[PDB]
Structure formats: C-alpha cells, structure tokens
Design an enzyme around this catalytic site. Structure first.
Site, PDB file in Angstrom:
ATOM      1  N   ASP A  15       4.516 -10.159  48.987  1.00  9.41           N
ATOM      2  CA  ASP A  15       3.408  -9.867  48.095  1.00  9.41           C
ATOM      3  C   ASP A  15       2.140 -10.473  48.684  1.00  9.41           C
ATOM      4  OD1 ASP A  15       1.948  -9.319  45.506  1.00  9.41           O
ATOM      5  OD2 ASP A  15       1.989 -11.520  45.467  1.00  9.41           O
ATOM      6  N   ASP A  17      -1.409 -10.977  47.005  1.00 11.89           N
ATOM      7  CA  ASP A  17      -2.192 -11.875  46.164  1.00 11.89           C
ATOM      8  C   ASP A  17      -1.335 -13.003  45.606  1.00 11.89           C
ATOM      9  OD1 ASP A  17      -4.872 -12.275  44.638  1.00 11.89           O
ATOM     10  OD2 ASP A  17      -3.303 -12.416  43.092  1.00 11.89           O
ATOM     11  N   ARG A 126      -6.013   6.520  38.292  1.00  4.99           N
ATOM     12  CA  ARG A 126      -5.779   5.704  39.476  1.00  4.99           C
ATOM     13  C   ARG A 126      -4.810   6.440  40.396  1.00  4.99           C
ATOM     14  NH1 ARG A 126      -4.456   0.155  35.903  1.00  4.99           N
ATOM     15  NH2 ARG A 126      -6.360   0.302  34.626  1.00  4.99           N
ATOM     16  N   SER A 182      -4.371  -1.092  26.007  1.00  5.66           N
ATOM     17  CA  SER A 182      -3.990   0.092  26.772  1.00  5.66           C
ATOM     18  C   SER A 182      -2.500   0.127  27.074  1.00  5.66           C
ATOM     19  CB  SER A 182      -4.761   0.167  28.097  1.00  5.66           C
ATOM     20  OG  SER A 182      -4.326  -0.850  28.992  1.00  5.66           O
TER      21      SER A 182
HETATM   22 MG   LIG Z   1       1.024 -11.844  43.695  1.00 13.23          MG
END
Ligand SMILES: [Mg+2]
Ligand SMILES: [Cl-]
Ligand SMILES: [Mg+2]
Ligand SMILES: [Mg+2]
Ligand SMILES: [Mg+2]
Lengths: 251, 251
Positions: A15, A17, A126, A182
């Site tokens: 991953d 971030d 998106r 949402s």
């Molecule tokens: Mg992350």
C-alpha cells in the site's frame, strides 16, 4: 526482466499512503534505498486506490522505473517494467447504456424523495466507482453533521441502496454505505485484491503485502486477508523498514 | 400485515413438488380449496427449489396472490402478499471477479486431465448454483452410465472437488457430488432454510413446515430439522390434506 533476483519467486506489494510514505506525505529517501535494495532480491510493487497522477506526488516522478509493478486505482491502471499492462475503468466495464439508466434512475429517485437540505454533487463520477449523496458532497461540514443525523432517523441511504438493488438486479454492483453523507457503487471485487490478477502469470511462490489499514473496514482488509498473500500490518514507514530489513536480510 | 387471518402469528410453509402437488404435476382443486380455507386461519406460503416459471405451472397462474409468501429457488426470489420482497442470484452474490477465476480454473483443470469420453455442457450456469460435469451434460444415457463407472474407479469428481476447495478456500461454497456425471457448486446455506430470513421480521411463534423429502439427503431435511420450524413429513398431497384438516380444524 525478472532474472537478477535472489528470489525471483517472491513478490512484495505495498500500500502507498501510510505504508511507504507518512500519513499524507511523500516517500522518504531511506525508504527508496530500502526498496532499491529489496528489488535486488525480489520483485516489488505498489497498489493504491488513487490514480498515477496522485501517486507521483507520494512516490516520485520516476515511479514506473522504481517498481516492477505499479498498480493505480487498485490495479485498474497497471504498469509492468514501466510499460502499460492493462487499463480498465468503471464506465468501460458497465458501458454507457447501463450507466445512463443508472444515472437517470438516481436523478429521478433523488428528485422524488423529501429532503430538508440539498446542496450539490449528488453523483460523483470516478474511474472505479461512483459516489452517491442525497444531500450532496458540496454540503458544508455542519450540513454533513446535520444530514448524518437525519439519515440515521430516516434511513435515506439504506432505503435508496435497496431501491437500486431491486431496480438493477443484474448489474453486478456492490454498494457500500460509509461516512456521513454518501454511499459507494462499484463492480464487485474492485478493491486492492483486483491488482493480483495482473501478477498471476508469473506464478510466484510468495506474495507479500504491507498495508497500514488492514483492519475491518480499511482499504487493505481484503488484500491483507487474501489467500494469495502474506500480510504485514504496519503503522508507519518505520515499521515497513524495520520489517523489510530483517525479513529479507537487507544490508 | 396479516391482521385478517384467525391466527396471524402462525405461519405454514410448504414444499411444492410432492407435498402440495403430485409427483411432478399440477395442484389439485381440493388442495387449492384446502389452502384458501387454511389461508383464512394462518399465514401460508411455499418454498421450492425451482424458479417462478416452474411453480406457475405446478401451482397456477395467480400463484403470486394464492400465498402470503412465495419462495422460489429456496427463497432467492421472494414475494410477500404479491409484493417483491427480495431478489438474489448466485452470480450477484459471488461477483464477476470471483466467478471468472472459478470458471477459468475449471476450464483449465478439465483441459489438463485425461478423460476417455468428453461431450459438452461441462459447466452449467444456473440462477442459484453451477453444475460441473467432466464428461459434460450433453453425454447420452449410456455415456452417462459408462462415465459413472469410470468416475467411481478413478474418483474424477472427488479429486476435482478437493482441488477446487484448495484453490478457493475463502469462496464460502458447498460442493455436492450426486448422480452420474456432475457435482453442484453453490453458496453454503442455500437450501430451503434460506427462505426463513424473509419471515424473520414478523416473529411468528410457530412456523410449520410440510415436506415429502425430509429424509437424509432430501431437499426438505434442513428446513424440517431447523429449530425455528415444526416439521410435518408427508408422502403425497393426500397426506398434506389429511394433516391440515385436523391440525387447523378446517372443513
Ligand atoms: Mg494506506
Ligand atoms: Cl450531481
Ligand atoms: Mg493474506
Ligand atoms: Mg418436495
Ligand atoms: Mg423443526
């Protein structure tokens, strides 16, 4: 090529971030040298939910030559040795015909229900999903707080999701209600695990995954717990580095 | 809301084939009369493993208004007082991503093994399951007899089911080897008890179930033995008629 690696049969996926970079910042120099040394031993790659234009901010401009695999938008956009491997998007998969029925239904549905507060950005398009908000993503912080309480009392999102499932029973979509205002609509299985079909042809003996949100509800949950991976939960680039150094015996 | 019946807290669910109708044919007018009489007293419904297009032939055209609950395909399609309650399919539950991996694996597996006789319809896709046959469902009657002996000697289906379980350990599927040439693959718990979730909101004090194949291996076994039901084993509609008349004091 995959010829100059001690273990050409082990892949390590990250991953981006919070795993390779700090919580919202760019990658460290030690992490880059750590990856460079790791790439000498095994195949390396990254997977993140954003597009290549957001990961260059986190990973650098020369990203296609830093990783053996570059998975953007959970692997909807993929690169292998710096060449494009495959490209997929929501609209390409569902098609304009179905997407127009979906939008027209949602627009009509929203126009017919009773809401005290409406704003805008009721449908956000998106590349791997749409996001639907009865009040609209343009609601202010406090308007979102207020809507969340209204939605808990009147079950607006829940009822809308059920109406969509019965209107479109064969579209192959998953619905996820999250946050204050949402819900997400996306093809089933379009999470981080999507990227693994891209590496299948190499038949790796081991596929490691490192991610900082492997808990229930986090965007690493599925791929961490996937049978094709060995998961490593981390809380910082420092954890990633510490684990990499011992596990792959880096010098 | 069934506020009109004599006892709206009692539900009676019926298997269809062999319980409400003869071996494979239409429902009698006496059973219809018995059910409508019974309908005035209790909440009634049926559950069958076939789709609506078959039960409309077994139970009649206005089947939708002849029962308070209509459960087709064990309840994957549900109706309540003629209102659509829920809809579900095998492909909607598993998703195209996982189904494509499952199909690709089965096709490759079948292409690699050595069989003396191959025909067609190796994978039959159905609304609540798939059926997988190494020789293929297009095999003739004698070819099916020949394959049954081959399979019993070589354990082709057994080995394939074990290979499927090892490849897809997290798919949540049940495998059922049965008959001469094939095995079923369906989501675990997709039997007649699946329909019971659709009546959970009313909190009946008693849910009777009538079934002609409540033996070990029959399609009524699970719902008959379920702790939420009072089972009544039958052998024909005449048995069903007899029991209803006394238990619910008809006539
Ligand atoms: Mg992350
Ligand atoms: Cl909008
Ligand atoms: Mg795992
Ligand atoms: Mg039956
Ligand atoms: Mg029971």
């Amino acid at each position: 090529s995959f010829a100059n690696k001690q273990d050409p049969k082990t892949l390590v996926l990250f991953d981006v971030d919070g795993t390779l970079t700090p919580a919202r910042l760019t990658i460290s120099e030690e992490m880059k040298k750590t990856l460079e040394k790791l790439r000498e031993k095994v195949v390396i790659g990254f997977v993140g939910g954003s597009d290549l234009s957001k990961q260059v901010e986190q990973l650098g401009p020369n990203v296609l030559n830093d990783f053996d695999y570059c998975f953007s938008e959970n692997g909807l956009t993929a690169y292998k040795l710096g060449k494009e491997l495959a490209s997929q998007s929501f609209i390409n998969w569902i098609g304009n015909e179905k997407y127009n029925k979906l939008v027209k239904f949602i627009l009509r549905y929203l126009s017919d229900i009773d809401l005290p507060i409406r704003r805008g950005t009721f449908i956000e398009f998106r590349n791997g999903m749409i996001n639907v908000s009865p009040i609209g993503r343009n609601a202010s912080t406090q308007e979102r707080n207020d809507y969340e309480k209204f939605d808990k009392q009147h079950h607006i999102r829940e009822t809308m999701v059920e109406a969509l499932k019965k209107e479109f029973p064969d579209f192959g979509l998953t619905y996820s209600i999250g946050g204050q205002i949402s819900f997400d609509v996306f093809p089933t299985g379009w999470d981080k695990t999507y990227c693994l079909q891209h590496v299948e042809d190499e038949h790796f003996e081991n596929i490691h995954f490192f991610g900082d949100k492997s808990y229930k509800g986090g965007n690493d949950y599925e791929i961490y717990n996937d049978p094709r991976t060995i998961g490593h939960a981390v809380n910082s680039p420092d954890d990633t580095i510490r684990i990499l150094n011992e596990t792959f015996k880096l010098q």
